Design a protein around this ligand. Structure first.
Ligand SMILES: *[C@H](O)[C@H](C[C@@H]1CCNC1=O)NC(=O)[C@H](CC(C)(C)C)NC(=O)[C@@H](NC(=O)OCc1ccccc1)C1CC1
Ligand SMILES: *[C@H](O)[C@H](C[C@@H]1CCNC1=O)NC(=O)[C@H](CC(C)(C)C)NC(=O)[C@@H](NC(=O)OCc1ccccc1)C1CC1
Lengths: 300, 300
């Protein structure tokens, strides 16, 4: 038992990170097959693709450790550079590129100079930012989930907004949210709490022996949603309730009783008590995250 | 910027996890060179020396993916079994076996049937437990730190105590804390807060822009101590103050002044405010961890 913020194991992603140097800018790249994916602003109100046509293949130093990968061709797909190199990465996992939805979580392998520094779990916030940990040179670090043996890359890091939150793209180069890879003013937008995740985390708490917050008040999805709007919570939908099925069925607490639990926590606070070692309602565990961890799902 | 609970990348440990089955008991083992380390209760108020002498090398199916490893010897060092096998692990990294002190952190690569499930950080609490995430079948999972390219193995899991906390050994088989690997009633003992860690996380907060908790008050080492023991915080030594020097100089906040901040936080609480997104005072970040995350250090 116990419950912790758990990342995927990152060896499948570690074996892909490369350093991409161009001019006096260095950042990270993702080497899959004979392609290196990286943020286009390594070539830097830019006209990126005017700036790209003025580039040559030999202008791009790609270093997989202490071995120089040589670029045989390049193209730009939205906000990512794709660098065609002369070597297939023999450590290329089975992979896909996916675009995650907000509320969904993923592991970030933060890198600098091609080298993995640490791994941690993030959620895509409702305002299309992530609360990451990223310094100068961490761009090109990827987020990912694993299913069985296949890596689903969902995030690549590009920028930090003034409120200390982070913004990036999928591996197709399209930003999450209304951000651009340009050093002009832009703000994260107001965030909201991922309600379905909070409820998932309360189930996890029950599955682990935290029941002090429970009651047997019930509620309707409509009455609950009136309260969710009052406290800056995302609306709860019947689809959310459905995904919460397995969790409810394992604990014996109907979704709508646990929603009534959430409501009393929202109106009365937690009153000096902690849930799973936290004094706040945690919203970065999906239902799938709860089920995987509380049942020991592993990955080949 | 940002500060999140960050694990070492796990791929060097991933290449060393195997499945160890004996009788009907399966748990995880660590395969370095031609030796597989695992919890000794895999051969299970027993008598382990008697139980071991009754075992043959063929009783141990050590299973590495789809490559059965032939056992060709065995021995018991305290609570760990050492299974010499006929193949040296080609993916053996540079490694060390270290016994860590309380307050020190490490990453845990939770595993099941020799397959990684996730990675996360933990601290050796002062009562020699850890607050992990471990189910049936997770024994043999290791805790570790990474330095340049060297894996310092420091923990191997064995058991969960009734409070939901977790107990284990170093890789020389010696338990942390008074605990024994048998189904005899044993409780964790009273835990305390790692004061030096809380102060380091206060600095992380400062480096990341949370200053609301600071003040111009100051204190003596003993006066702040007089307060820590009131609140179950552990003594702060002058050795700890020294270790906080780098953080003190980078922020220009003297440690005894940060102690004054923490003192005020202990006597008044957080009163609705968060620090680094927590409403409790976090103690599972060492000064190391802060400097490494807030400066970006990597691992080849
Ligand atoms: C890639 O290594 C870095 C990562 C940044 C640096 C520290 N933390 C990070 O996540 N990315 C950048 O340096 C980008 C470069 C561009 C903009 C993608 C070309 N710059 C930023 O992250 C800057 N953010 C920014 O420009 O956001 C909009 C903004 C808001 C207010 C005033 C001006 C601009 C920020 C580091 C300076
Ligand atoms: C190895 O896979 C497991 C890991 C445990 C299982 C659940 N979570 C974990 O971290 N280890 C065990 O099953 C041990 C086996 C021994 C005792 C180490 C040989 N058993 C336990 O963890 C059990 N706890 C226990 O025996 O603690 C002492 C105790 C306390 C109170 C009353 C009696 C005994 C418990 C999981 C079943």
């Amino acid at each position: 038992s116990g419950f912790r913020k758990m990342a995927f194991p990152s060896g499948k992603v570690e074996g892909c990170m490369v350093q991409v140097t161009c001019g006096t800018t260095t950042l990270n790249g993702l080497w899959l097959d004979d392609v290196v994916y990286c943020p286009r602003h390594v070539i830097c109100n830019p006209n990126y693709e005017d700036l790209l046509i003025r580039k040559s293949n030999h202008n791009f130093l790609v270093q997989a450790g202490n071995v120089q990968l040589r670029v045989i061709g390049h193209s730009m797909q939205n906000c990512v550079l794709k660098l065609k190199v002369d070597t297939a990465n023999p450590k290329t996992p089975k992979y896909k590129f996916v675009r995650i939805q907000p509320g969904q979580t993923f592991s970030v392998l933060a890198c600098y100079n091609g080298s993995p520094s640490g791994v941690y779990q993030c959620a895509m916030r409702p305002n299309f930012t992530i609360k990451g940990s990223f310094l100068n040179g961490s761009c090109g670090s990827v987020g990912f989930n694993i299913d069985y043996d296949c890596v689903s890359f969902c995030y690549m890091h590009h920028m930090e907004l003034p409120t200390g939150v982070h913004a990036g793209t999928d591996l197709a180069g399209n930003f999450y949210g209304p951000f651009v890879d340009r050093q002009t003013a832009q703000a994260a937008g107001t965030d909201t709490t991922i309600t379905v995740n909070v409820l998932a985390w309360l189930y996890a708490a029950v599955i682990n022996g935290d029941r002090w917050f429970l009651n047997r008040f019930t509620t309707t999805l409509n009455d609950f949603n009136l309260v969710a709007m009052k406290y800056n919570y995302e609306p709860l939908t019947q689809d959310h309730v459905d995904i919460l099925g397995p969790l409810s069925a394992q604990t014996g607490i109907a979704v709508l009783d646990m929603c009534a639990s959430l409501k009393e926590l929202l109106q009365n606070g937690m009153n000096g008590r902690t849930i799973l070692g936290s004094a706040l309602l945690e919203d970065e565990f999906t239902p799938f995250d709860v089920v995987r961890q509380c049942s020991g799902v592993t990955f080949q």
